[PDB]
Write an enzyme that holds these catalytic residues in place. Structure first.
Site, short mmCIF file in Angstrom:
data_model
loop_
_atom_site.label_atom_id
_atom_site.label_comp_id
_atom_site.label_asym_id
_atom_site.label_seq_id
_atom_site.Cartn_x
_atom_site.Cartn_y
_atom_site.Cartn_z
N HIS A 290 48.11 37.62 36.08
CA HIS A 290 48.24 38.97 36.64
C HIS A 290 49.26 39.82 35.92
CE1 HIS A 290 46.52 36.63 40.07
NE2 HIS A 290 45.71 37.66 40.05
N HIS B 38 45.47 41.62 31.91
CA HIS B 38 44.49 41.66 33.00
C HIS B 38 44.26 43.10 33.44
CE1 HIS B 38 42.34 40.89 36.71
NE2 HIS B 38 43.34 41.39 37.43
N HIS C 37 46.16 48.42 39.66
CA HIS C 37 45.71 47.55 40.75
C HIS C 37 46.47 46.25 41.00
CE1 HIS C 37 43.56 44.77 38.15
NE2 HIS C 37 43.42 44.01 39.22
N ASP C 38 47.18 45.72 39.99
CA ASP C 38 47.98 44.49 40.14
C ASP C 38 49.43 44.68 39.68
OD1 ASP C 38 46.34 42.54 41.38
OD2 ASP C 38 45.44 41.89 39.50
N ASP D 274 37.39 43.39 38.47
CA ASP D 274 38.47 42.45 38.75
C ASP D 274 37.97 41.00 38.64
OD1 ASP D 274 41.17 41.98 39.52
OD2 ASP D 274 40.67 41.90 41.61
N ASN E 292 35.79 38.14 34.73
CA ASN E 292 36.07 37.12 33.69
C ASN E 292 34.89 36.18 33.40
OD1 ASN E 292 39.49 36.46 34.85
ND2 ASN E 292 38.71 38.21 33.65
N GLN F 25 35.77 26.44 38.68
CA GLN F 25 35.10 27.60 38.10
C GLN F 25 33.65 27.66 38.57
OE1 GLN F 25 36.23 30.39 36.51
NE2 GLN F 25 38.15 29.42 37.17
N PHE G 225 33.76 28.96 42.06
CA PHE G 225 34.15 30.37 42.04
C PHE G 225 32.92 31.23 41.71
CE2 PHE G 225 36.46 33.76 39.36
CZ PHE G 225 36.81 34.53 40.46
C1 LIG Z 1 39.27 33.18 36.08
O1 LIG Z 1 39.05 32.58 37.37
C2 LIG Z 1 39.72 33.11 38.48
C3 LIG Z 1 40.23 34.43 38.56
C4 LIG Z 1 40.87 34.86 39.74
C5 LIG Z 1 41.43 36.23 39.75
C6 LIG Z 1 40.63 37.43 39.39
C7 LIG Z 1 41.24 38.61 39.47
C8 LIG Z 1 42.62 38.70 40.00
O2 LIG Z 1 43.24 39.76 40.11
N1 LIG Z 1 43.19 37.51 40.35
N2 LIG Z 1 42.60 36.30 40.28
C9 LIG Z 1 41.04 33.98 40.80
C10 LIG Z 1 40.53 32.68 40.72
C11 LIG Z 1 39.86 32.24 39.57
O3 LIG Z 1 39.32 30.98 39.32
C12 LIG Z 1 38.79 30.04 40.26
F1 LIG Z 1 39.45 28.87 40.06
F2 LIG Z 1 38.98 30.39 41.55
MG LIG Z 2 45.03 41.87 42.86
ZN LIG Z 3 43.31 41.84 39.56
#
Ligand SMILES: COc1cc(-c2ccc(=O)[nH]n2)ccc1OC(F)F
Ligand SMILES: [Mg+2]
Ligand SMILES: [Zn+2]
EC number: 3.1.4.53
Length: 321
Positions: free
Chosen positions: A73, A77, A113-114, A228, A231, A279, A282
């Protein structure tokens, strides 16, 4: 070095921008240079009479408030979410849909945003009785803080990029930005997605038709949320770096939790973690449902993004057996 940076910035309108390289080539100023490039590309400086010097001063100030020692963060990002939002705003299905003020709001929201993220979750802040959780009454703790910081920095010397907006425009932009950043809180994900699905189901075309604030802001909220959580939709070499970074951040939070005698949060225990299974989960439970819905809204504009997401899911899954 400046020539190489300019070369990498030619890809600003493309999904898969080499954001880490831009971070290095810009002397750790990816947010500043990507924002400046996007404002130039969209002609936002002329449209809103933003002095260039003011834009750069604010951006550098904002960037300075992202923590250099947080693996995920951070300013890279933020730059990535900004650029991803910029690409999503240009999707053919949304051509002519948003006003210049709404576009400005979405890009600014993505940038802040962060900001000032400490590298730990809302739940960690709540469980540790942190100053942030006490200030914000356990509700969207981080997201409220990011907004407060992002707006407060506009008040620094030569930092008010909205100085030439009318009062009505400033009022509207402030409300939109707040609504967008608050929607990045993961606790709002399920409701945000349910509403996006309803929009896809009641979709009207002509290009998408969005006549009222509720619908327009809802699309912008989901757009920035998609950015957001973008990724896993990026080329694998980028995605794997983001995974390495979020896991580093999670593991550091787990180390803090273990030191306090607390139960270690999901995925934060470096001694009992499966990065690959995490992952795949997720993607399966959060990212794919969201992106498939977004792709449906703008079909077929996001097909290549969805294909990449699916390929990356298969790749991570293949490493497990
Ligand atoms: C890149 O993967 C992840 C990314 C995030 C993520 C995305 C945007 C953000 O602001 N914070 N975290 C949160 C969890 C993740 O991985 C999984 F293990 F849950
Ligand atoms: Mg955030
Ligand atoms: Zn973010």
């Amino acid at each position: 070095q400046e020539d190489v940076l300019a070369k990498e910035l030619e890809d600003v309108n493309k999904w898969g921008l080499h954001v880490f390289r831009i971070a290095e080539l810009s002397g750790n100023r990816p947010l500043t240079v990507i924002m400046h490039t996007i404002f130039q590309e969209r002609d936002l400086l002329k449209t809103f009479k933003i002095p260039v010097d003011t834009l750069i001063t604010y951006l550098m100030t904002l960037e300075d408030h992202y923590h250099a020692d947080v693996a995920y963060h951070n300013n890279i990002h933020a730059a990535d979410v900004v650029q991803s939002t910029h690409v999503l705003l240009s999707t053919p299905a949304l051509e002519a849909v948003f006003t210049d003020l709404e576009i400005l709001a979405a890009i600014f929201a993505s940038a802040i945003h962060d900001v000032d993220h400490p590298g730990v979750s809302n739940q960690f802040l709540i469980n540790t009785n942190s100053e942030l959780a006490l200030m914000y009454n356990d509700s969207s703790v981080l997201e409220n803080h990011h907004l407060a910081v992002g707006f407060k920095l506009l008040q620094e010397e030569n930092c008010d990029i909205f100085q030439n907006l009318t009062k009505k425009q400033r009022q509207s932009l402030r409300k939109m930005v707040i609504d967008i950043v608050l929607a990045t809180d993961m606790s709002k994900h399920m409701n945000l997605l349910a509403d996006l699905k309803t929009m896809v189901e009641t979709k009207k075309v002509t290009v998408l038709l969005l006549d009222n604030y509720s619908d327009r802001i809802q699309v912008l909220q989901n757009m920035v949320h998609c950015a957001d959580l973008s990724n896993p939709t990026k080329p694998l070499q980028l995605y794997r770096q983001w995974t390495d970074r979020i896991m580093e951040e999670f593991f550091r939070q787990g180390d803090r939790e273990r030191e306090r005698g607390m139960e270690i949060s999901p995925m934060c225990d470096k001694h009992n973690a499966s990065v690959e299974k995490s992952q795949v989960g997720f993607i399966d439970y959060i990212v794919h449902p969201l992106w498939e819905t977004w792709a449906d809204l703008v079909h077929p504009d996001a097909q290549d993004i969805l294909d990449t997401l699916e390929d990356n899911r298969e790749w991570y899954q293949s490493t497990i057996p």
